[PDB]
Amino acid sequence: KVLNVWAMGDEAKSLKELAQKFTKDTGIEVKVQVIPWANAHDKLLTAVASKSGPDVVQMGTTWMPEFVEAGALLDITKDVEKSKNMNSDLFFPGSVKTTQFDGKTYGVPWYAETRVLFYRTDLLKKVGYNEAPKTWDELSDAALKLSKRGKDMYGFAIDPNEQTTGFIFGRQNGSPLFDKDGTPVFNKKPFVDTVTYLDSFIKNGSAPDTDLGLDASQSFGGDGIVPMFMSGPWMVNTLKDTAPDIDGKWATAVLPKKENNESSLGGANLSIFKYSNKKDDALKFMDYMSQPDVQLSWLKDTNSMPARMDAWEDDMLKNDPYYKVFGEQMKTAEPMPLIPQFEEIAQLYGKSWEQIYRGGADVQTQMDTFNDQVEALLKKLEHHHHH
Ligand SMILES: OC[C@H]1O[C@@H](O[C@H]2[C@H](O[C@H]3[C@H](O[C@@H]4[C@@H](O)[C@H](O)[C@@H](CO)O[C@@H]4O)O[C@H](CO)[C@@H](O)[C@@H]3O)O[C@H](CO)[C@@H](O)[C@@H]2O)[C@H](O)[C@@H](O)[C@@H]1O
Numbered sequence: 048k049v050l051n052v053w054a055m056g057d058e059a060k061s062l063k064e065l066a067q068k069f070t071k072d073t074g075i076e077v078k079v080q081v082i083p084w085a086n087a088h089d090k091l092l093t094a095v096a097s098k099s100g101p102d103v104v105q106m107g108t109t110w111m112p113e114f115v116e117a118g119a120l121l122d123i124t125k126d127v128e129k130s131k132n133m134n135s136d137l138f139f140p141g142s143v144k145t146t147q148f149d150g151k152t153y154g155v156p157w158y159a160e161t162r163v164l165f166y167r168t169d170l171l172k173k174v175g176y177n178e179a180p181k182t183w184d185e186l187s188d189a190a191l192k193l194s195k196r197g198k199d200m201y202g203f204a205i206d207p208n209e210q211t212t213g214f215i216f217g218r219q220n221g222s223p224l225f226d227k228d229g230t231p232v233f234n235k236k237p238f239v240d241t242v243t244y245l246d247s248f249i250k251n252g253s254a255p256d257t258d259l260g261l262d263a264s265q266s267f268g269g270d271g272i273v274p275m276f277m278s279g280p281w282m283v284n285t286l287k288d289t290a291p292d293i294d295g296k297w298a299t300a301v302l303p304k305k306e307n308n309e310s311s312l313g314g315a316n317l318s319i320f321k322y323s324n325k326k327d328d329a330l331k332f333m334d335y336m337s338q339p340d341v342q343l344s345w346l347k348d349t350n351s352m353p354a355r356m357d358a359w360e361d362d363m364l365k366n367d368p369y370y371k372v373f374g375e376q377m378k379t380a381e382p383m384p385l386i387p388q389f390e391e392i393a394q395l396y397g398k399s400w401e402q403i404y405r406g407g408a409d410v411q412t413q414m415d416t417f418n419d420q421v422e423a424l425l426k427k428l429e430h431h432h433h434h
């Protein structure tokens with residue numbers, strides 16, 4: 048009797064609230080499950096293996112190609128063309144790219160995100176930076192200077208389990224990641240030099256080489272143990288809600304540049320699980336949640352980025368300092384490679400990064416290994432497409 052919705056993290060709390068109003072408005076009962084992002088990919092895999100799971104699923108954009116490849120998401124092309132709230136034409140092209148495969152559409156953008164630099168304005172001033180670092184050389188320099196405040200003080204965080212980080216920096220140094228032929232180029236100089244660059248922060252003590260176990264207010268607030276980092280909109284919301292002691296002492300900025308300062312485009316879509324016996328009510332739910340006023344309500348409350356383009360004309364999105372930075376960054380933000388093995392490739396990058404930063408492996412050598420692993424994965428997939 049109940050429409051099952053799987054959602055993730057902090058956003059799923061807003062979705063649960065909205066779903067309560069949906070149930071009041073339509074009479075359709077809805078149970079929203081809240082799944083940590085850390086566990087979600089495994090939970091999705093289990094649902095696919097068992098063909099049992101939710102009716103509506105919040106899908107991280109980077110996993111769209113995987114779960115379309117697996118046949119787990121319903122083709123909703125005809126249905127979204129005929130909604131006035133879910134039509135692809137309303138959304139940013141980069142967001143739409145995460146939903147469309149071989150001419151068919153498999154979800155509706157729910158929110159977008161991109162990654163920006165968060166920095167303590169007061170602490171950067173004290174090391175001679177009146178504005179955020181704007182190049183790789185400046186990020187390195189400021190970070191190293193901030194790390195000299197003390198043995199347990201740092202300058203910049205590199206999250207070893209953040210799928211986007213290595214690949215963002217790689218593209219900034221001109222690596223396409225995969226060349227025109229689909230061949231991975233992780234062992235070519237642009238990428239190798241990127242990973243050397245990131246390792247430089249570990250080697251010089253300016254990025255922590257273990258998880259310090261601090262929440263954002265404890266690491267970025269107070270005396271600013273970690274005084275620069277990269278994140279998305281959800282960290283503006285977190286810091287506004289949890290770090291009052293640094294109100295007026297931090298800001299965001301666009302990413303520092305190397306060749307370019309491109310960031311990632313991510314977020315989440317709403318999709319219908321292929322095996323659902325509630326497809327009609329799933330679509331009603333998605334249409335309702337795509338109402339522009341329903342969207343803007345929760346988006347602005349959480350400082351989140353709409354994937355719907357006309358939302359950006361809203362006075363807050365044009366004039367709020369955080370939204371100005373996100374909007375600027377979004378102009379050039381690109382999805383991670385939209386390939387069905389992305390997550391597994393990212394996890395492989397993670398292992399290789401750990402061999403380097405913790406194991407002391409030579410970067411070129413480890414990138415040769417990693418690139419071979421990736422090529423092997425791609426061949427393994429190709430073979431499934433050639434029976
Ligand atoms: O990778 C799948 C999917 O990720 C989306 O990013 C979402 C982000 O998830 C990242 C995670 O963030 C956590 C946060 O969820 C958690 O509440 C706090 C406190 O525990 O810690 C982090 O900040 O970070 C890990 C790396 O450590 C990363 O793997 C996750 O992707 O969570 C945000 C808060 O819910 C979401 O706003 C954000 O969308 C991408 O947007 C999407 O493209 C990816 O497919």
Ligand SMILES: [Mg+2]
Pocket residue numbers: 193194195196197198199200201252
């Ligand atoms: Mg130090």
